[PDB]
Design a protein around this ligand. Sequence first.
Ligand SMILES: CCCCCCCC(=O)OC[C@H](COP(=O)(O)O[C@@H]1[C@H](O)[C@H](O)[C@@H](OP(=O)(O)O)[C@H](OP(=O)(O)O)[C@H]1O)OC(=O)CCCCCCC
Ligand SMILES: COCC(CCO[C@H]1CC[C@@]2(C)C(=CC[C@H]3[C@@H]4C[C@@H]5O[C@]6(CC[C@@H](C)CO6)[C@@H](C)[C@@H]5[C@@]4(C)CC[C@@H]32)C1)COC
Ligand SMILES: COCC(CCO[C@H]1CC[C@@]2(C)C(=CC[C@H]3[C@@H]4C[C@@H]5O[C@]6(CC[C@@H](C)CO6)[C@@H](C)[C@@H]5[C@@]4(C)CC[C@@H]32)C1)COC
Ligand code: NA
Ligand code: NA
Lengths: 512, 150
Amino acid sequence: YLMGGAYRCNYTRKRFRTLYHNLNHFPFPFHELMVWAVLMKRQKMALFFWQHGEEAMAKALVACKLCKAMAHEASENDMVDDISQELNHNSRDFGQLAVELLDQSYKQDEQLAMKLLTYELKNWSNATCLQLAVAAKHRDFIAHTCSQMLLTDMWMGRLRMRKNSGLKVILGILLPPSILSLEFKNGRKIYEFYNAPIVKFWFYTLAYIGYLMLFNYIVLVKMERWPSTQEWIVISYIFTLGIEKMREILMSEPGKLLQKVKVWLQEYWNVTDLIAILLFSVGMILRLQDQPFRSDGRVIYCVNIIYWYIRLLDIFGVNKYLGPYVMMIGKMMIDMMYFVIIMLVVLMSFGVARQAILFPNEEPSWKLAKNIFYMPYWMIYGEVFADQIDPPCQLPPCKTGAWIVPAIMACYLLVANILLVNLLIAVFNNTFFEVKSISNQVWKFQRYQLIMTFHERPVLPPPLIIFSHMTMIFQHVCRDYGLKLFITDDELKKVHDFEEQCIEEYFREKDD
Amino acid sequence: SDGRVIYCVNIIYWYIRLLDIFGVNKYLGPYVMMIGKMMIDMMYFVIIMLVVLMSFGVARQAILFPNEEPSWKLAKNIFYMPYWMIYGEVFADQIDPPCQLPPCKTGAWIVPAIMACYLLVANILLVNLLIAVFNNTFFEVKSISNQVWK
Ligand SMILES: CCCCCCCC(=O)OC[C@H](COP(=O)(O)O[C@@H]1[C@H](O)[C@H](O)[C@@H](OP(=O)(O)O)[C@H](OP(=O)(O)O)[C@H]1O)OC(=O)CCCCCCC
Ligand SMILES: COCC(CCO[C@H]1CC[C@@]2(C)C(=CC[C@H]3[C@@H]4C[C@@H]5O[C@]6(CC[C@@H](C)CO6)[C@@H](C)[C@@H]5[C@@]4(C)CC[C@@H]32)C1)COC
Ligand SMILES: COCC(CCO[C@H]1CC[C@@]2(C)C(=CC[C@H]3[C@@H]4C[C@@H]5O[C@]6(CC[C@@H](C)CO6)[C@@H](C)[C@@H]5[C@@]4(C)CC[C@@H]32)C1)COC
Ligand code: NA
Ligand code: NA
């Protein structure tokens, strides 16, 4: 219950249940001893038990996750609020121990360090160290150099092209004969090329670019009574994308259909995609009707194309420099919202004053609510036309107190364009280093999720993914790498010896 | 006439090449190299602004004119007016015209709202973030430029 949905402790297995039914020993006693010390808030005992035995990094990550879960449970049940602080401190200590051990292992030997993070852990419900670190939301562990290089190796697949990627992958996708010219890591070459995560990502990117081109074409030119070929291709793309989203919902982690909906709705992109697909379905339904409903469907298409243009930032978030910038944009959006509230108050004040002064004989109409916001808002973006505001009133009679409007305009412009915008620039300037560092760490953490979700995806892009969906139905009646790495007993022994050497060297260096 | 036009483009280049001569002054060389690096940063932010601009332009062109034959003038109206709009030319009669009066197009009230959102994003968020980026990465660039010039 504390670890997660997919975790399976050895105590609840059928073999241990049968052994405990008629009541031996434990192969690794320090695992159970450290779990006991962690569950009972004995930090010194847990730290003593951590450095004895094998799988030190796995024990550190498991202890960090357990302490975090216990802190959350204690804070939920209104404890003394000092237990929660102690548990959070314990979790931070164990996370720091894991990070320092990883740093020592990577500094000593690199290949064995990578082998440490991917080999399957039989004692911990068959989960690698990367999965334990991700399940603990440990951002400083995934953002380490060794974890990043391992993720790059997983992302590149079975290819060794490391000089200039992307262009060669694009050439291979566009020229299938050009595939048999790339070096591979130690017929089947095509299967290894089309199953790498990077090739799947570029296939999806090219399909999305073509879909955007077709959407622009169908909205720009005149729409006839019945959909043209490009409109049918766009509708097919939307339908297959919706089917793929439903398939991803179905194969989530929880065992209930209603519970998987919440977990899938955790991310904002999924919610926005669902809303956009529903809106496109409504617009397509309204499009196949008479003329006014056809126009309404066309307008819905235009709004939807705004969203699908905006969604290119998700694709851009794979570049090393275009992901942190997008997350910085997100946080600066919150700050800009606060300052927009104040500017809106000032703008409403000026607009109401000018509208009331200049036009004193207006009947109640909804056009009054438009003149308040429209002109003062366009005024602060350079459209400061001084004949439309305070007109020179042969000449028409001057309204009573119409000389106040230019003075109020001067004060409003001085406040809006010299004070608030400069203060906003200062706010963005003095809170940039922290936001930049946080964005870098979060992007390096989410690289793992990107790689995993493109490793689990099918090969064909959504325009022609309907073939891959039918094969799953046909195979319904019937991880060597990418997730784990299975090794023999000699390799396991060598890994254990290397880890013990690393931890004893780390403690010796710390003491010295 | 074609040769004359090529001459005009070439004169642009030969005017730009005065920075090579300016790079002998003690204070006008480091500034040019700083300009070079800030050009790379400005390229990154130009990509994002271009995405936003294309979205708004396509939306406005599709909403306002629904009976246009396929022509290369469509590809011009997307980039032209939204690009000149963010440099102070925010003429509100050319965009969302007041439609004696001609009939109002279906859903033509969305264009000013989209314009407001687009202006707020382009002129308050991205440019201020670019100013912050230039501001917080100036000391290192300045020192590197001084060393490289020397
Ligand atoms: C339509 C596309 C829109 C979505 C764009 C999709 C998002 C996107 O832009 O891709 C990112 C990727 C760039 O990364 P890519 O692997 O190709 O190359 C990186 C680049 O060469 C850096 O200079 C390297 O060192 P550093 O960082 O300076 O230290 C870095 O090495 P490392 O540190 O990793 O070991 C390299 O990774 O691909 C391209 O843009 C190449 C042209 C292909 C795209 C151009 C053709 C379209
Ligand atoms: C074309 O003819 C229209 C007619 C119906 C006319 O009804 C009128 C009823 C009052 C109403 C809704 C109208 C115009 C100004 C409207 C104000 C604008 C204000 O703005 C807000 C702005 C921001 C707020 C903070 C302050 O108030 C409103 C509370 C305020 C506001 C909405 C009060 C309501 C006013 C229209 C049709 O019927 C046959
Ligand atoms: C004067 O008459 C011209 C006529 C030839 C007309 O051909 C038309 C063919 C479609 C084409 C090339 C035309 C106008 C809009 C064009 C779109 C603009 C889009 O912009 C881009 C913008 C940015 C992209 C991201 C999205 O798409 C295009 C993929 C898109 C684009 C280039 C698709 C192609 C469209 C012209 C002459 O023949 C006798
Ligand atoms: Na201006
Ligand atoms: Na102007």
